[PDB]
Amino acid sequence: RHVRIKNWGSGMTFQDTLHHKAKGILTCRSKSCLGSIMTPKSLTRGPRDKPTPPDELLPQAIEFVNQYYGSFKEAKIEEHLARVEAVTKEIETTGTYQLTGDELIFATKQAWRNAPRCIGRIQWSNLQVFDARSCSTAREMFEHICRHVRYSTNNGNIRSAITVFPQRSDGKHDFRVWNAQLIRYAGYQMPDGSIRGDPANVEFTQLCIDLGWKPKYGRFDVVPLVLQANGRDPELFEIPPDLVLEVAMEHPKYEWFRELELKWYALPAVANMLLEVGGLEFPGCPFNGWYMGTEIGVRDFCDVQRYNILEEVGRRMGLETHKLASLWKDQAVVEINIAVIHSFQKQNVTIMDHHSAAESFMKYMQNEYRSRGGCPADWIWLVPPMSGSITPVFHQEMLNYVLSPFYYYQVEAWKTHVWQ
Amino acid sequence: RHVRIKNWGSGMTFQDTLHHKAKGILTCRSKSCLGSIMTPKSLTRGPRDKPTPPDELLPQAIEFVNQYYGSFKEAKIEEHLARVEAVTKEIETTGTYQLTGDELIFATKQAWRNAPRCIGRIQWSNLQVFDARSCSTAREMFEHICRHVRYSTNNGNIRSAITVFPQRSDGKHDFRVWNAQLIRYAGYQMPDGSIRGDPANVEFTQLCIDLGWKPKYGRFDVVPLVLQANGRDPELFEIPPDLVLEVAMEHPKYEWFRELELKWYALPAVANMLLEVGGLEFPGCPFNGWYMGTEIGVRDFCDVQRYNILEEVGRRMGLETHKLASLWKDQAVVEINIAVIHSFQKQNVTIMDHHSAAESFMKYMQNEYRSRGGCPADWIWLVPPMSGSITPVFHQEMLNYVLSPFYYYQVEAWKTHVWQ
């Protein structure tokens, strides 16, 4: 009982059976589709008070094992039986189990593939897995994070990597990075109420400030890392500036663009999500890829609740800023995006334009239906926030479902954290 | 219970209660969201062979009367309940019922209001309803439609209007327009293998040629209306040229845009949908509004399966069309859309840009929540094909659901027509 989906631009169709393996968690019903909801609690894995009862954990562990051994081109039936026995007992003995280093590598790459809002999934097999499950202290987390950052930054030739911290035990000893991103700029509410820097980051910058960080009141101040080790209250650590590559924004025809004095960091890294694997939850697993120009050019720079430079750019381009119908906003957003693309390239830092990205995703999607008869995808997030129908993705019908392993959101740590 | 949704670019939130009155017909399960499917069977109201079982009909009939009568600030229980009585008898006796003139006006507007994929809904209360439920012939249908086209074109000052043809009886005497739109250009499969005109219309165009129309082999040849009266084989009727307002495409600065020799028609009218009202189905109800610039500039002119002029425009613009990262496709699509809105304005024909349209939709969405505690909306359809996040609609979370009255899809007539 597959579900046929079609691409109205190429006529290509896929039959989807994989969604049958999905968890019955989405909130859509016959009466209503809630697909445009950003952070549904269906895509959220929140805080635990007790450890997962072992009996409850057993079935999911075996399923992951079966899934792990199932990825084997050349089946290891014997190794497979062994491992299933090993896990059953380990859970029987320790109430939990540890993934081998290879099962973790597999689990990380698979959760990326099962990430329906990620357009960069064609690179799913190129992922550096930093095993940091041995971790015990906030300082150690800091060092693992700087290693990751130096690795992935790689002097501009950005590389993907994930750092997996210790798995959740009882939920009272979680290893989590409170930051949404590893690198992110601060936002400050000035004494008169106005905001300087990234307005989306005002709340968290205050937390940092409340924890001892010295505010610098600039437009682009990298906030410090707020690390929670072993469920202890978090500690601040500042990424050494030499590990933070940044790009100054210039525009290939507009000399004055440089006067805007804009820049953005090279490393996109999600730090506050939870990796789910065979029943196990990993509350700390920062991961990164490289940038899709539109994230900076359209969202970071043009969202009204972010940097909001559209008005000022339209004005400098000499556009009919007074009427919507002149499409000045659309001319501005394109030039800003050309700037972003042009600047990273100039400085030799990895960045992909939304067209090449979408074309790579179509390729990935086809490979997925070919290999596993399915590819969970969220149309709303995959389609670029600029030139939608100009991309193949816009014209692609998709199915959105949650498989396993999966990268879930969590409740923001400060919201749940009991300070001691 | 309600469902709270929020706009991330304004902070406004709504609490949806209306969704409970929606029809449980969406195919989204907990295990899968297929909201990106374009023509789902859940949104399709197909053919019949028997009349609607009166037992099934009656409740939907009553519900409608209640809704209708409930729509007055000044209530009238006497009149209301009597109309419930009347409709009961009618269905009991006749096995069906007939709406009043005012009820039909209410149903059409209310169905428009309940049209999730419509960004134009703020205008929902301004709709001219051409009653033609007495219609009996193909020429008569053609005459009602010519009246409709003339009223709506209004010399460029476009007006919204719907023409309701007789309600379906037993499914064997459906009054229907086979064409998707009232006005649309033809697509020809040329001998050298190329396609001339609108490629998306090659199939319907061949159908017309098969029914006896003389193909003109031009790029913008209006196809003949293919009209089915009382279930009879369809009959062709070409709309008087003088009744077809068109706009020659020109760009405000690019003098060579005229060399492209493009033009488009001013009246957009969905000709093949089904109006559902209290159990009643009206397979023929052509409606129209005015154009949102993007439909023509991004979709009709830029889809690769349509006119696909992106490449030559980019070339004419002197862009690095060989490099996707140059964002040449983005610069070209912006100028194409500026030509569109410029040309319509210059020729004094009604058209609305996507920022202005998106803005009005937000105004409408709020009124709706204040009014009925709901507003079914399809995010995927409502977000313009270009510059998505620059518009407030992108940042708006929505609930998509099916209410009554409602405009559904139908299986294309030819796929089901038994030629007598």
Ligand code: HEM
């Ligand atoms: C290989 C280069 C990569 C590119 C270009 C890329 C690009 C993107 C983009 C453009 C988004 C949309 C997010 C937004 O707009 O907020 C996204 C989301 C996401 N990416 Fe990828 N990504 C890459 C690698 C990765 C890796 C390695 C992982 C996990 C190991 C990953 C996991 C995710 C997840 C989980 C989301 C959803 C985030 C959310 O819910 O906010 N990505 N990515």
Ligand code: HEM
């Ligand atoms: C008042 C000016 C109007 C504007 C600017 C407008 C604009 C639009 C746009 C841009 C779409 C998306 C279509 C696409 O891209 O395929 C749409 C869809 C739709 N409109 Fe509106 N519209 C208007 C009036 C109306 C009226 C008066 C009705 C009904 C009497 C209506 C019913 C619909 C329906 C049912 C759809 C869904 C079409 C489909 O499923 O293909 N619209 N409209």
Ligand SMILES: C[C@H](O)[C@H](O)[C@H]1CNC2=NC(N)=NC(=O)C2=N1
């Ligand atoms: C596959 C995908 O659902 C389709 O390409 C959709 C996307 N959104 C859309 N939106 C609008 N307004 N018209 C379309 O034809 C359309 N096509």
Ligand SMILES: C[C@H](O)[C@H](O)[C@H]1CNc2nc(N)[nH]c(=O)c2N1
């Ligand atoms: C409300 C709506 O779901 C929200 O604006 C979404 C739309 N699509 C998106 N897509 C991406 N990639 N990133 C986002 O933050 C969003 N936001």
Ligand SMILES: [Zn+2]
């Ligand atoms: Zn859904």
